[PDB]
Copies of this chain bind each other. A is one copy, B any other.
């Protein structure tokens, strides 16, 4: 048993990380088949970033202005184009290590693994949630741009995130692999407002189920509630509303533990109203909302890839 924040094995993704340099700027790129994906701000100077005109900046670049290195292998760039906020660099060689993959745009509250990279070389792997305000609270240093987030299903890598920037608040923003930002953000160096962040209620409930499965039961109470009553309390504590679809998703966990979803909501409403009183749940003194229902089931079933 046990329960940890757990990343997907990163091997299939390591094999796609390459280094992309343009003029003075270097960052990471993702090489799938014969195309290298990377953030378009690779074509900017530091002074450009204050207010970039991306199509005028890209006008000035030819194919040979793009240095793409895969390990020590130099890739020949034979085409370039901009799609929203990512550059696509057509290269003359298909990545022989390309996994089966898809590009997908996740929903707020869903989780993914981040393979942090620098100069095209993997540095570490960790799990992240897309917050309700479409930021992520990661660990990215200068040069980490182009690092990607992904989920794996057996042998298929679903790429869902490419890293573009750290906001002045110190949280992180990026795009899907078609270059569309998550949230209202743009790739310009200006202060930009992320919305009010909120707690991912369905994830908290899933984590409470993980706790019961692992023996932590002190928070189980003798009350119950309704979806509407609970949602009134959810709103008061800046928690995402809970929907019927969320109840349905929590179905398998409720069947395993014998605890009906609305009975777990009554437990949570009590932890919200009375606090945790210095007690812990699965080694944490705060309510944890970065495990989805699928993450919990994965880690209490043993799915492999």
Interface residues of A (CB under 8 A from B): 1-12, 14-15, 115-119, 121-126, 137-144, 166, 170-172, 214-215, 280, 283-286, 298-305
Contact = CB atoms under 8 A, between A and B. Distances in A.
A82 to B, nearest CB: 28
B1 A122 contact: no
Nearest to A172: B2
Contacts of A138: 2, 4
Contact of A137 (B9, B14, B283, B303): B283
A298 B118 CA distance: 12
A30 to B, nearest CB: 15
Given A123-B9, A170-B214, A3 B304 contact: no
Given A1-B141, A7-B125, 11 more contacts: A2-B137, A4-B139, A8-B124, A9-B123, A9-B124, A11-B14, A117-B304, A118-B302, A118-B304, A123-B303, A170-B214
Contact of A299 (B117, B139, B300): B139
A122 B152 CA distance: 11
A253 to B, nearest CB: 16
A122 B15 contact: no
B3 A11 contact: no
A9 B118 CA distance: 13
A304 B215 contact: no
Nearest to A3: B139
B14 A126 contact: no
A93 to B, nearest CB: 20
A283 B284 CA distance: 11
